[PDB]
Structure 1
Amino acid sequence: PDRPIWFPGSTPPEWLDGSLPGDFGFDPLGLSSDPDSLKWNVQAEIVHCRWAMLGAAGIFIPEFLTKIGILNTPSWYTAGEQEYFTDKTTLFVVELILIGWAEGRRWADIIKPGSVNTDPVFPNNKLTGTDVGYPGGLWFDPLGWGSGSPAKLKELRTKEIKNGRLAMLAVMGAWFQHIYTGTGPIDNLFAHLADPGHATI
Protein backbone atom coordinates (compact mmCIF):
# COMPACT_ATOMS: atom_id res chain seq x y z
CA PRO A 1 0.00 0.00 0.00
CA ASP A 2 3.00 2.29 0.53
CA ARG A 3 4.89 1.10 -2.55
CA PRO A 4 6.21 3.71 -4.99
CA ILE A 5 3.67 4.65 -7.65
CA TRP A 6 4.08 5.61 -11.29
CA PHE A 7 2.17 8.87 -10.62
CA PRO A 8 3.18 10.07 -7.14
CA GLY A 9 0.33 11.54 -5.15
CA SER A 10 -2.36 9.66 -7.07
CA THR A 11 -4.41 6.60 -6.10
CA PRO A 12 -3.60 3.15 -7.55
CA PRO A 13 -6.40 1.03 -9.03
CA GLU A 14 -8.33 -1.25 -6.71
CA TRP A 15 -7.40 -4.50 -8.47
CA LEU A 16 -3.66 -3.74 -8.23
CA ASP A 17 -2.93 -4.40 -4.55
CA GLY A 18 0.92 -4.78 -4.83
CA SER A 19 0.93 -8.62 -4.54
CA LEU A 20 2.51 -9.16 -8.02
CA PRO A 21 6.23 -8.72 -8.93
CA GLY A 22 6.90 -5.43 -10.78
CA ASP A 23 3.60 -3.75 -9.68
CA PHE A 24 3.52 0.10 -9.67
CA GLY A 25 -0.28 0.66 -10.05
CA PHE A 26 -0.11 1.55 -13.75
CA ASP A 27 -3.42 0.73 -15.43
CA PRO A 28 -5.27 3.87 -16.57
CA LEU A 29 -7.56 2.05 -19.02
CA GLY A 30 -8.47 -0.83 -16.69
CA LEU A 31 -7.58 -3.60 -19.13
CA SER A 32 -7.33 -6.11 -16.26
CA SER A 33 -10.20 -5.17 -13.94
CA ASP A 34 -11.42 -8.81 -13.74
CA PRO A 35 -9.23 -11.61 -12.33
CA ASP A 36 -9.21 -13.83 -15.43
CA SER A 37 -7.99 -10.99 -17.64
CA LEU A 38 -5.42 -10.22 -14.95
CA LYS A 39 -3.99 -13.74 -15.04
CA TRP A 40 -4.00 -13.85 -18.84
CA ASN A 41 -2.26 -10.47 -19.07
CA VAL A 42 0.36 -11.51 -16.51
CA GLN A 43 1.20 -14.63 -18.54
CA ALA A 44 1.30 -12.60 -21.77
CA GLU A 45 3.63 -10.03 -20.22
CA ILE A 46 6.01 -12.74 -18.89
CA VAL A 47 6.21 -14.46 -22.32
CA HIS A 48 6.65 -11.16 -24.17
CA CYS A 49 9.48 -10.23 -21.73
CA ARG A 50 11.33 -13.54 -22.32
CA TRP A 51 11.05 -13.39 -26.14
CA ALA A 52 12.01 -9.68 -26.16
CA MET A 53 15.18 -10.30 -24.06
CA LEU A 54 16.29 -13.08 -26.47
CA GLY A 55 15.51 -10.77 -29.41
CA ALA A 56 17.34 -7.75 -28.01
CA ALA A 57 20.45 -9.80 -27.29
CA GLY A 58 20.34 -11.33 -30.76
CA ILE A 59 19.87 -7.99 -32.50
CA PHE A 60 22.46 -5.97 -30.63
CA ILE A 61 25.37 -8.24 -29.62
CA PRO A 62 25.94 -9.49 -33.22
CA GLU A 63 25.68 -6.01 -34.74
CA PHE A 64 28.17 -4.49 -32.30
CA LEU A 65 30.82 -7.14 -32.93
CA THR A 66 30.49 -6.63 -36.68
CA LYS A 67 31.17 -2.90 -36.34
CA ILE A 68 34.39 -3.41 -34.37
CA GLY A 69 35.23 -5.90 -37.09
CA ILE A 70 35.53 -9.16 -35.16
CA LEU A 71 32.72 -10.87 -37.12
CA ASN A 72 31.21 -10.28 -40.56
CA THR A 73 27.49 -10.95 -40.17
CA PRO A 74 24.85 -9.19 -42.30
CA SER A 75 22.26 -6.70 -41.08
CA TRP A 76 19.50 -8.04 -38.85
CA TYR A 77 16.88 -6.30 -40.99
CA THR A 78 17.78 -8.24 -44.14
CA ALA A 79 18.84 -11.49 -42.45
CA GLY A 80 15.66 -13.10 -43.77
CA GLU A 81 16.69 -12.58 -47.40
CA GLN A 82 19.85 -14.70 -47.44
CA GLU A 83 19.74 -18.17 -48.98
CA TYR A 84 20.12 -21.05 -46.51
CA PHE A 85 20.38 -24.81 -46.99
CA THR A 86 16.65 -25.07 -47.75
CA ASP A 87 13.66 -22.96 -48.73
CA LYS A 88 12.27 -20.71 -46.01
CA THR A 89 8.78 -22.25 -45.99
CA THR A 90 10.12 -25.65 -44.95
CA LEU A 91 11.96 -24.02 -42.05
CA PHE A 92 8.75 -22.20 -41.11
CA VAL A 93 6.81 -25.47 -41.08
CA VAL A 94 9.42 -27.24 -38.92
CA GLU A 95 9.34 -24.24 -36.58
CA LEU A 96 5.55 -24.38 -36.47
CA ILE A 97 5.51 -28.07 -35.53
CA LEU A 98 8.18 -27.80 -32.84
CA ILE A 99 6.93 -24.56 -31.28
CA GLY A 100 3.38 -25.94 -31.45
CA TRP A 101 4.39 -28.89 -29.32
CA ALA A 102 6.30 -26.57 -26.98
CA GLU A 103 3.56 -23.93 -26.60
CA GLY A 104 0.70 -26.44 -26.63
CA ARG A 105 1.75 -27.86 -23.27
CA ARG A 106 2.10 -24.28 -21.92
CA TRP A 107 -1.55 -23.63 -22.87
CA ALA A 108 -2.81 -26.58 -20.82
CA ASP A 109 -0.88 -25.38 -17.71
CA ILE A 110 -2.63 -21.96 -17.90
CA ILE A 111 -6.11 -23.54 -18.14
CA LYS A 112 -5.53 -26.42 -15.68
CA PRO A 113 -2.45 -25.78 -13.47
CA GLY A 114 -0.13 -28.71 -12.64
CA SER A 115 -1.63 -31.19 -15.18
CA VAL A 116 1.39 -31.28 -17.52
CA ASN A 117 4.15 -31.69 -14.93
CA THR A 118 5.01 -35.30 -15.86
CA ASP A 119 7.20 -36.73 -18.60
CA PRO A 120 4.99 -38.57 -21.13
CA VAL A 121 7.75 -41.06 -21.97
CA PHE A 122 9.79 -41.55 -18.76
CA PRO A 123 7.50 -40.97 -15.75
CA ASN A 124 10.55 -40.83 -13.45
CA ASN A 125 11.03 -37.23 -14.62
CA LYS A 126 9.04 -34.19 -13.36
CA LEU A 127 8.91 -30.39 -13.36
CA THR A 128 8.96 -28.90 -9.80
CA GLY A 129 7.57 -25.32 -10.09
CA THR A 130 4.31 -24.50 -8.20
CA ASP A 131 3.59 -21.17 -9.98
CA VAL A 132 2.11 -20.69 -13.49
CA GLY A 133 4.85 -19.21 -15.74
CA TYR A 134 7.71 -20.40 -13.45
CA PRO A 135 8.05 -24.14 -14.40
CA GLY A 136 11.32 -24.99 -12.55
CA GLY A 137 12.80 -28.53 -12.65
CA LEU A 138 16.15 -29.75 -14.08
CA TRP A 139 15.20 -28.48 -17.59
CA PHE A 140 14.30 -24.81 -16.87
CA ASP A 141 16.12 -24.28 -13.52
CA PRO A 142 19.22 -26.60 -13.52
CA LEU A 143 21.04 -24.35 -10.96
CA GLY A 144 18.07 -24.39 -8.49
CA TRP A 145 17.98 -20.56 -8.01
CA GLY A 146 14.26 -20.34 -8.99
CA SER A 147 12.98 -21.33 -5.47
CA GLY A 148 13.52 -19.82 -1.99
CA SER A 149 11.95 -17.41 0.51
CA PRO A 150 9.25 -14.92 -0.71
CA ALA A 151 11.86 -12.11 -0.28
CA LYS A 152 14.42 -13.95 -2.52
CA LEU A 153 11.67 -14.60 -5.12
CA LYS A 154 9.93 -11.19 -5.25
CA GLU A 155 13.32 -9.56 -5.98
CA LEU A 156 14.33 -12.06 -8.74
CA ARG A 157 10.87 -12.00 -10.38
CA THR A 158 10.85 -8.15 -10.27
CA LYS A 159 14.38 -8.02 -11.81
CA GLU A 160 13.15 -10.28 -14.67
CA ILE A 161 10.08 -8.08 -15.36
CA LYS A 162 12.00 -4.74 -15.25
CA ASN A 163 14.68 -6.10 -17.64
CA GLY A 164 12.04 -7.55 -20.03
CA ARG A 165 10.15 -4.26 -20.32
CA LEU A 166 13.37 -2.42 -21.14
CA ALA A 167 14.21 -5.05 -23.76
CA MET A 168 10.80 -4.68 -25.42
CA LEU A 169 11.25 -0.92 -25.68
CA ALA A 170 14.77 -1.35 -27.07
CA VAL A 171 13.64 -3.84 -29.72
CA MET A 172 10.87 -1.58 -30.98
CA GLY A 173 13.32 1.30 -30.99
CA ALA A 174 15.76 -0.64 -33.14
CA TRP A 175 13.00 -1.54 -35.60
CA PHE A 176 11.83 2.05 -36.01
CA GLN A 177 15.38 3.42 -36.20
CA HIS A 178 16.22 1.05 -39.04
CA ILE A 179 12.97 2.00 -40.77
CA TYR A 180 13.61 5.74 -40.56
CA THR A 181 17.38 6.32 -40.64
CA GLY A 182 18.02 3.32 -42.90
CA THR A 183 21.16 2.21 -41.06
CA GLY A 184 22.11 -0.29 -38.38
CA PRO A 185 21.40 0.55 -34.74
CA ILE A 186 25.06 0.73 -33.71
CA ASP A 187 25.83 3.36 -36.35
CA ASN A 188 23.05 5.49 -34.87
CA LEU A 189 24.65 5.37 -31.42
CA PHE A 190 28.06 6.43 -32.74
CA ALA A 191 26.48 9.21 -34.80
CA HIS A 192 24.66 10.47 -31.70
CA LEU A 193 27.82 10.33 -29.60
CA ALA A 194 29.73 12.25 -32.30
CA ASP A 195 27.34 15.24 -32.37
CA PRO A 196 24.73 14.86 -29.60
CA GLY A 197 23.29 18.32 -30.25
CA HIS A 198 22.42 17.67 -33.90
CA ALA A 199 22.54 13.87 -34.44
CA THR A 200 18.85 13.61 -33.63
CA ILE A 201 15.52 12.95 -35.35
Structure 2
Amino acid sequence: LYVGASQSSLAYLDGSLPGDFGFDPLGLLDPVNSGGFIEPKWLQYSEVIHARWAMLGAAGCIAPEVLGAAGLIPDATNIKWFESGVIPPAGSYNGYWADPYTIFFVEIVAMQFAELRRLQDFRYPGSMGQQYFLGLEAIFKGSGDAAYPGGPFFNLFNLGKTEAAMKELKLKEIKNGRLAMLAMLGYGAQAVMTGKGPFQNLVEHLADPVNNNILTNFG
Protein backbone atom coordinates (compact mmCIF):
# COMPACT_ATOMS: atom_id res chain seq x y z
CA LEU A 1 0.00 0.00 0.00
CA TYR A 2 2.75 2.44 0.96
CA VAL A 3 5.79 3.35 -1.11
CA GLY A 4 8.64 0.85 -1.00
CA ALA A 5 6.41 -2.23 -0.80
CA SER A 6 7.47 -5.44 -2.50
CA GLN A 7 6.35 -8.99 -3.28
CA SER A 8 8.87 -10.34 -0.76
CA SER A 9 7.26 -8.51 2.17
CA LEU A 10 3.71 -9.24 0.96
CA ALA A 11 4.30 -12.98 1.44
CA TYR A 12 4.13 -12.71 5.24
CA LEU A 13 2.24 -9.38 5.55
CA ASP A 14 -1.39 -10.40 5.02
CA GLY A 15 -2.89 -7.50 7.00
CA SER A 16 -3.42 -9.27 10.34
CA LEU A 17 -1.16 -6.91 12.30
CA PRO A 18 -2.40 -3.35 12.95
CA GLY A 19 -0.90 -0.74 10.67
CA ASP A 20 0.13 -3.34 8.09
CA PHE A 21 0.80 -1.30 4.95
CA GLY A 22 3.20 -3.82 3.40
CA PHE A 23 6.20 -1.60 4.15
CA ASP A 24 9.13 -3.90 4.93
CA PRO A 25 11.90 -3.61 2.30
CA LEU A 26 14.43 -4.97 4.79
CA GLY A 27 12.42 -8.14 5.51
CA LEU A 28 12.51 -7.94 9.29
CA LEU A 29 9.24 -9.84 9.83
CA ASP A 30 10.12 -12.98 7.92
CA PRO A 31 8.99 -15.89 10.14
CA VAL A 32 11.26 -18.36 8.32
CA ASN A 33 14.48 -18.94 10.31
CA SER A 34 13.73 -16.09 12.71
CA GLY A 35 14.95 -15.88 16.28
CA GLY A 36 16.39 -13.76 19.05
CA PHE A 37 14.79 -10.32 18.98
CA ILE A 38 14.19 -10.15 15.20
CA GLU A 39 10.88 -12.00 15.22
CA PRO A 40 7.26 -10.83 14.67
CA LYS A 41 6.08 -10.87 18.30
CA TRP A 42 9.02 -8.92 19.76
CA LEU A 43 9.15 -6.50 16.82
CA GLN A 44 5.42 -5.69 16.97
CA TYR A 45 5.62 -5.36 20.76
CA SER A 46 8.63 -3.06 20.53
CA GLU A 47 6.87 -0.95 17.90
CA VAL A 48 3.78 -0.38 20.05
CA ILE A 49 5.94 0.30 23.13
CA HIS A 50 7.96 2.87 21.17
CA ALA A 51 4.71 4.31 19.83
CA ARG A 52 3.24 4.91 23.29
CA TRP A 53 6.51 6.24 24.74
CA ALA A 54 6.95 8.58 21.77
CA MET A 55 3.36 9.82 22.07
CA LEU A 56 4.00 10.75 25.69
CA GLY A 57 7.36 12.22 24.70
CA ALA A 58 6.03 14.42 21.90
CA ALA A 59 3.17 15.73 24.02
CA GLY A 60 5.51 16.33 26.96
CA CYS A 61 8.18 18.02 24.88
CA ILE A 62 5.76 20.48 23.27
CA ALA A 63 3.39 21.05 26.25
CA PRO A 64 5.51 23.38 28.49
CA GLU A 65 6.42 25.76 25.65
CA VAL A 66 2.83 25.93 24.36
CA LEU A 67 1.40 26.38 27.86
CA GLY A 68 4.01 29.03 28.64
CA ALA A 69 3.22 30.94 25.46
CA ALA A 70 -0.44 31.15 26.53
CA GLY A 71 0.42 32.37 30.04
CA LEU A 72 -1.11 29.36 31.79
CA ILE A 73 2.15 28.43 33.54
CA PRO A 74 4.62 30.96 35.04
CA ASP A 75 7.95 32.12 33.65
CA ALA A 76 10.11 30.12 36.09
CA THR A 77 8.88 26.98 34.29
CA ASN A 78 8.33 26.91 30.48
CA ILE A 79 11.81 25.86 29.42
CA LYS A 80 13.01 23.80 26.48
CA TRP A 81 12.70 20.02 26.73
CA PHE A 82 16.47 19.56 26.47
CA GLU A 83 17.04 22.15 29.23
CA SER A 84 14.74 20.66 31.91
CA GLY A 85 17.55 18.64 33.50
CA VAL A 86 17.76 15.83 30.95
CA ILE A 87 21.12 16.93 29.56
CA PRO A 88 22.92 19.14 32.13
CA PRO A 89 25.44 20.48 29.54
CA ALA A 90 22.49 21.79 27.51
CA GLY A 91 20.77 23.26 30.58
CA SER A 92 19.11 22.21 33.81
CA TYR A 93 16.27 23.24 36.12
CA ASN A 94 16.98 23.76 39.83
CA GLY A 95 13.36 24.27 40.91
CA TYR A 96 12.56 20.62 41.59
CA TRP A 97 11.95 19.23 45.06
CA ALA A 98 15.25 17.31 44.91
CA ASP A 99 18.35 16.86 42.79
CA PRO A 100 17.93 14.94 39.50
CA TYR A 101 19.91 11.94 40.79
CA THR A 102 17.54 11.36 43.73
CA ILE A 103 14.57 11.52 41.37
CA PHE A 104 16.48 9.27 38.97
CA PHE A 105 16.90 6.61 41.66
CA VAL A 106 13.17 6.78 42.38
CA GLU A 107 12.59 6.37 38.64
CA ILE A 108 15.00 3.41 38.60
CA VAL A 109 12.99 1.53 41.23
CA ALA A 110 9.63 2.50 39.70
CA MET A 111 10.61 1.68 36.10
CA GLN A 112 12.25 -1.60 37.14
CA PHE A 113 9.07 -2.77 38.85
CA ALA A 114 6.84 -1.78 35.91
CA GLU A 115 9.16 -2.89 33.08
CA LEU A 116 10.22 -6.17 34.70
CA ARG A 117 6.61 -7.16 35.44
CA ARG A 118 5.69 -6.22 31.86
CA LEU A 119 8.56 -8.35 30.55
CA GLN A 120 7.43 -11.30 32.64
CA ASP A 121 3.91 -11.05 31.22
CA PHE A 122 5.46 -11.12 27.76
CA ARG A 123 7.72 -14.11 28.52
CA TYR A 124 5.11 -16.04 30.54
CA PRO A 125 1.60 -14.96 29.49
CA GLY A 126 -0.65 -14.55 32.51
CA SER A 127 2.12 -15.09 35.08
CA MET A 128 1.51 -11.65 36.61
CA GLY A 129 -1.96 -12.69 37.80
CA GLN A 130 -1.05 -15.38 40.35
CA GLN A 131 1.69 -14.18 42.73
CA TYR A 132 0.52 -11.83 45.46
CA PHE A 133 1.03 -8.15 44.64
CA LEU A 134 -1.19 -6.49 47.29
CA GLY A 135 -4.31 -7.52 45.37
CA LEU A 136 -3.12 -5.87 42.15
CA GLU A 137 -2.63 -9.25 40.44
CA ALA A 138 -6.34 -9.29 39.55
CA ILE A 139 -5.66 -6.70 36.81
CA PHE A 140 -2.28 -8.05 35.63
CA LYS A 141 -3.60 -11.23 33.99
CA GLY A 142 -3.28 -9.63 30.56
CA SER A 143 -4.47 -11.47 27.47
CA GLY A 144 -3.02 -13.53 24.64
CA ASP A 145 -1.23 -10.53 23.12
CA ALA A 146 1.46 -8.95 25.31
CA ALA A 147 1.10 -5.68 23.39
CA TYR A 148 -2.59 -5.40 24.40
CA PRO A 149 -3.02 -6.64 28.00
CA GLY A 150 -6.22 -4.83 28.90
CA GLY A 151 -8.14 -5.61 32.04
CA PRO A 152 -9.95 -3.47 34.62
CA PHE A 153 -7.19 -0.83 34.59
CA PHE A 154 -5.45 -1.00 31.19
CA ASN A 155 -8.94 -0.95 29.63
CA LEU A 156 -10.63 1.32 32.16
CA PHE A 157 -13.64 2.39 30.08
CA ASN A 158 -13.92 -0.92 28.16
CA LEU A 159 -13.33 0.82 24.85
CA GLY A 160 -13.42 -1.20 21.65
CA LYS A 161 -15.87 -3.90 22.69
CA THR A 162 -16.45 -4.98 19.08
CA GLU A 163 -13.63 -6.69 17.18
CA ALA A 164 -13.87 -4.16 14.34
CA ALA A 165 -13.82 -1.25 16.80
CA MET A 166 -10.75 -2.71 18.50
CA LYS A 167 -9.00 -3.11 15.14
CA GLU A 168 -9.89 0.48 14.19
CA LEU A 169 -8.58 1.87 17.48
CA LYS A 170 -5.41 -0.25 17.21
CA LEU A 171 -4.73 1.17 13.75
CA LYS A 172 -5.30 4.69 15.08
CA GLU A 173 -2.92 4.03 17.98
CA ILE A 174 -0.13 2.68 15.78
CA LYS A 175 -0.50 5.55 13.28
CA ASN A 176 -0.47 8.20 16.02
CA GLY A 177 2.54 6.51 17.60
CA ARG A 178 4.48 6.40 14.33
CA LEU A 179 3.73 10.09 13.80
CA ALA A 180 4.92 10.80 17.35
CA MET A 181 8.13 8.82 16.75
CA LEU A 182 8.85 10.93 13.67
CA ALA A 183 8.04 14.02 15.74
CA MET A 184 10.52 13.00 18.45
CA LEU A 185 13.20 12.46 15.80
CA GLY A 186 12.41 15.91 14.44
CA TYR A 187 12.55 17.37 17.96
CA GLY A 188 16.04 16.00 18.51
CA ALA A 189 17.26 17.07 15.07
CA GLN A 190 15.86 20.58 15.54
CA ALA A 191 17.40 20.79 19.01
CA VAL A 192 20.82 19.92 17.61
CA MET A 193 20.39 22.12 14.50
CA THR A 194 18.69 25.29 15.77
CA GLY A 195 19.30 24.98 19.50
CA LYS A 196 15.76 26.15 20.27
CA GLY A 197 12.48 24.56 21.28
CA PRO A 198 10.17 22.89 18.76
CA PHE A 199 7.35 25.39 19.31
CA GLN A 200 9.77 28.28 18.78
CA ASN A 201 10.92 26.65 15.54
CA LEU A 202 7.31 26.28 14.38
CA VAL A 203 6.54 29.93 15.21
CA GLU A 204 9.70 31.17 13.46
CA HIS A 205 8.88 29.05 10.41
CA LEU A 206 5.29 30.31 10.30
CA ALA A 207 6.50 33.92 10.48
CA ASP A 208 8.80 33.58 7.44
CA PRO A 209 8.81 30.13 5.79
CA VAL A 210 11.31 31.02 3.04
CA ASN A 211 13.92 32.42 5.45
CA ASN A 212 13.31 29.86 8.25
CA ASN A 213 13.87 26.25 7.18
CA ILE A 214 16.54 23.54 7.25
CA LEU A 215 18.27 25.20 4.29
CA THR A 216 18.74 28.57 5.98
CA ASN A 217 19.57 26.97 9.35
CA PHE A 218 22.71 25.29 7.99
CA GLY A 219 24.73 28.45 8.62
Smaller-chain TM-score bracket:
0.7 to 0.9
Question: Equivalent of 1:11, from 7, 11, 35?
Answer: 7
Q: What SS class does the counterpart of residue 65 from structure 2 fall into?
A: helix
For the aligned residue pairs, the C-alpha RMSD in angstroms reads 2.1
The more displaced of 96-105 and 61-70 is 61-70
In structure 1, C-alpha distance between the alignment counterparts of 2:136 and 2:194, rounded to whole Å = 54
- On the 8 A contact 1:109/1:132 being kept in 2, the answer is yes
1:163 equivalent in structure 2: 176
Deviations 1:24-65 (A, max 9, x none): 111111122136511100110011011111111111122112
The more displaced of 82-91 and 58-67 is 82-91
Question: Equivalent of 1:30, from 27, 36, 42?
Answer: 27
Deviations 1:176-196 (A, max 9, x none): 112111222112112211222
The more displaced of 80-89 and 158-167 is 80-89
1:82 equivalent in structure 2: 93
1:104 equivalent in structure 2: 116
Q: Which runs of 5+ in 2 are unaligned?
A: 86-91, 215-219
- On the 8 A contact 1:119/1:126 being kept in 2, the answer is no
Cα deviation for residue 126 of structure 1 reads 3.5
Q: Percent identity?
A: 45
Kindly report which structure 2 residues correspond to 1:11-160, keeping only aligned pairs within 5 A, or say none: 11=7, 13=9, 14-34=11-31, 37-71=39-73, 72=75, 73-80=78-85, 81-83=92-94, 84-118=96-130, 120=132, 121-122=134-135, 125-127=138-140, 129-130=142-143, 131-146=145-160, 148-160=161-173
- Matched to 1:145, the amino acid is L
- On the 8 A contact 2:129/2:137 being kept in 1, the answer is no
- On the 8 A contact 1:174/1:185 being kept in 2, the answer is yes
Change (3 A) 1:103 1:124: closer
Q: Which has the higher contact order (CA 8 A, sep 6+)?
A: 1
In structure 1, C-alpha distance between the alignment counterparts of 2:120 and 2:150, rounded to whole Å = 16
Change (3 A) 1:124 1:188: closer
In structure 2, C-alpha distance between the alignment counterparts of 1:197 and 1:15, rounded to whole Å = 44
What is the aligned length? 196
Change (3 A) 1:191 1:126: closer
Cα deviation for residue 78 of structure 1 reads 0.7
- On the 8 A contact 1:117/1:127 being kept in 2, the answer is yes
Cα deviation for residue 7 of structure 1 reads 2.9
- Matched to 1:103, the amino acid is E
TM-score for both structures, normalised by structure 2: 0.81
- Matched to 2:119, the amino acid is W
Q: What SS class does the counterpart of residue 109 from structure 2 fall into?
A: helix
- On the 8 A contact 2:121/2:127 being kept in 1, the answer is yes
In structure 2, C-alpha distance between the alignment counterparts of 1:9 and 1:135, rounded to whole Å = 31
In structure 1, C-alpha distance between the alignment counterparts of 2:179 and 2:137, rounded to whole Å = 39
Question: Equivalent of 1:181, from 183, 189, 194?
Answer: 194
In structure 2, C-alpha distance between the alignment counterparts of 1:93 and 1:172, rounded to whole Å = 27
